[PDB]
Each structure stands twice: as structure tokens, then as C-alpha cells.
């Protein structure tokens with residue numbers, strides 16, 4: 001399979017960490033230059049008409065949305081289902097956390113930072129408050145819990161690691177969210193794809209310089 | 210099980226349509242008054258600390274995020290898996306469309322309309338353009354396709370019906386998106402929960418008056 005991605009991109013990094021966790025290798029890895037509008041070529045649009053990254057191309061099957069890709073990888077290539085168990089309630093909790101990561105947590109990241117880094121607009125107080133609301137919820141989810149979505153490390157932890165590490169490299173101070181801070185330091189240690197993720201975070205950090 | 214919801218709410222309506230499709234009855238249905246901040250009671254926060262609707266409470270298991278609830282209902286209570294097949298590639302396509310519905314399509318709805326209806330702010334041109342971008346993508350997804358996420362009617366069609374019907378009742382003109390318009394008229398006919406959804410849309414419409 002071919003992965004179309006950028007190393008700096010959080011949704012790409014969640015996919016990369018998942019592949020590492022599963023021992024999956026991508027036979028082709030292609031960095032898409034979005035500045036050069038490489039995602040708008042007729043060839044790319046034929047694979048993914050939404051012209052987004054990450055995009056996976058697996059023997060004529062095309063897939064996008066990072067969190068859809070993460071579940072697909074576990075279901076198709078996982079030697080076990082530990083990261084996304086077949087148990088309906090376990091899966092549902094992980095799914096809720098994945099939608100939270102997209103719709104609340106990472107959404108707060110992009111809505112606060114993207115206008116500054118890409119449109120040179122001033123920092124917005126209301127958008128910052130939404131980050132804080134999102135971290136408060138995550139901090140609550142993690143109260144008395146080692147992992148973010150059940151008794152075991154799961155896809156939710158990978159997704160949150162990609163997002164929270166982006167906040168980290170952006171300089172968002174989350175020290176006061178004690179459960180988040182504790183979860184984060186622990187999860188790093190359990191994630192074989194952590195180096196690669198943090199290296200990508202360093203690439204993303206260039207947008208601030 | 211108990212459903213906490215509002216009839217006007219699109220993510221609630223997607224859950225309601227799913228229950229109808231599956232022949233699922235909720236033993237308790239509770240309308241949450243969000244104006245009266247009923248979601249902030251200690252009792253509600255104990256079930257769902259994110260204080261959102263829809264929330265499902267199923268024998269001590271609490272679940273939120275509409276699209277997580279939709280999959281949970283099919284997996285736990287479905288007499289078959291037609292709406293969310295076990296096939297890994299079929300599921301992945303439906304999952305991508307569900308994330309699209311949350312992160313692109315319904316996101317464009319709330320970001321354009323909510324500031325007007327709730328904060329009395331003026332209509333924003335950039336936010337309207339994002340609606341159009343989202344409908345263009347959906348129109349492309351539907352090119353030569355009867356349904357939105359595979360050869361059969363699925364959870365993706367239910368999710369999109371909840372979202373597109375909200376656009377409809379809000380007065381967003383999507384006639385020019387020929388595939389969307391065609392898909393919409395057809396999908397209504399195949400959806401046993403359509404009346405209830407459209408009735409909820411009428412309740413939501415009161416925010417414009």
C-alpha cells in the first residue's frame with residue numbers, strides 16, 4: 001500500500017504511529033507538497049476527490065480520514081484486536097473518544113492556531129478558551145484512568161498522542177491538567193512510534209518560526 | 210435504555226432515525242432543556258461529563274457522540290449488519306463518510322448558522338463558502354452512486370440525511386448539486402424514520418423565527 005502524507009501533520013502522524021504499533025510497512029510513502037498544490041493533480045483527485053492527507057491506497061482501495069484509516073489498519077492488518085477490540089462497548093468508547101479528538105480537541109487546535117500561522121491573524125481569546133474546555137474534558141475522562149478509552153492502551157491513545165504532542169510543540173501549556181500530563185508522559189513510553197511522531201512535531205514547529 | 214436528546218438537534222435525529230431503522234425502542238426518552246442548563250446537573254454529568262446530547266444510557270453503559278451511538282446500535286441491536294457491514298473495506302468507507310459528515314459537512318452548518326441564530330452575528334461569506342465546498346465534495350462522492358457510502362443504504366446515508374435536512378429547513382439552496390438533490394429525494398423514501406426527522410427539523414426551524 002501507498003501512504004500519502006506529511007510528517008508534520010497530526011492526522012498523518014496518528015496513522016504513522018498506528019502502522020508502527022501494528023508492524024505495518026507502507027511499500028510507498030509519498031510526501032505531498034500542499035503548498036505546490038500537489039493534492040490537486042488529476043492523479044491525486046482520482047484516488048481522493050477530497051484532496052486531503054493522509055490518504056491510503058491499498059490495492060485499488062482508497063481511504064482517507066486518519067481515524068478511519070487507523071481502524072482499517074487494525075482490522076485488516078492487526079495480528080490482534082488489542083487496539084480496537086471486537087467488544088461492542090469497548091469499541092463504542094474508543095469511537096466516542098476518536099470523534100472527541102476530531103471534533104473537540106484537534107478542532108480547538110486548528111481553530112486557534114491555523115489563523116495565526118497561515119493567515120497571520122491575531123490570537124483569539126474565545127478560540128483559546130475552547131482549547132481549555134477541550135483539555136478540561138480530556139482531564140476529566142482521564143480521572144482515575146491510566147488510558148483514555150478503557151483498561152488498555154487503544155487507538156484513542158494514539159489519536160490523542162498525535163493531537164496533544166501538537167499542542168506540546170506549539171507551546172500550549174497543559175501542565176495544570178494533571179491527568180492529561182500524567183497520561184501523556186506514560187503513553188509516550190508505551191508508543192513504539194513516538195520518536196517518529198515527535199520528529200514530525202519538530203517539522204510542524206517550523207510554521208511558528 | 211434511556212436516550213437524552215432534543216427533537217430539533219441533527220445529531221439526535223441521526224440517532225432517532227437509526228433506532229427506527231433497526232426497530233429499536235428507547236424505554237425512556239428524555240428531552241434535555243439546554244437553555245435551562247439541564248445538562249449541567251450533577252446527575253447528568255455523572256452519565257456524560259461532556260454534558261452533550263445525544264447521550265445513550267444502556268444498563269449502566271453511557272455513550273455519547275451521535276455517530277458512535279449509531280454504530281453501537283447497529284452492532285448491539287441490529288438484526289443484521291446491513292447498515293454497517295462486517296466487511297473491513299465497507300466499514301472503512303462508511304467511517305470516512307461519518308467523519309466527513311461531522312468534520313466537514315455538519316461543521317460547515319454549525320459554523321455558518323450558529324453565530325447568526327444564537328449570537329445574532331451577521332452572515333459570514335467565508336463560512337458560507339465552506340458550506341459550498343462541503344456540498345461540492347458530497348456531490349462528487351455521489352457521482353454515479355445511488356447511496357453515499359457503498360452499493361447499499363448505510364449509516365452514512367442516515368447521518369447525511371440528518372445533516373442535509375437541517376440545511377434544507379434552514380433554507381440553504383442545494384438544488385444545483387444535482388447528485389445531492391437526487392440522493393436526498395431517494396433516501397427520504399427509504400428511511401422509515403423520515404417523518405420524525407422532518408418533524409424535528411420543523412422544531413429546529415423555530416430558531417430562525
Ligand SMILES: N[C@@H](CCC(=O)N[C@@H](CS)C(=O)NCC(=O)O)C(=O)O
Nearest residue numbers: 009011051052053054065066067312
Ligand atoms: N479530518 C481529517 C483531516 C485531514 C486534513 O484536513 N489534512 C490537511 C493537512 S493536516 C490537508 O489534507 N489539507 C490540504 C487540503 O485539504 O487540500 C483527518 O483526520 O484525516
Ligand SMILES: N[C@@H](CCC(=O)N[C@@H](CS)C(=O)NCC(=O)O)C(=O)O
Nearest residue numbers: 103218220260261262263274275276
Ligand atoms: N459531535 C456531537 C455533537 C453533539 C452536540 O454538540 N450537541 C449539542 C446540541 S446539538 C449539545 O449537547 N450542546 C450542549 C452542550 O454541549 O452543553 C455528536 O455528534 O453527538
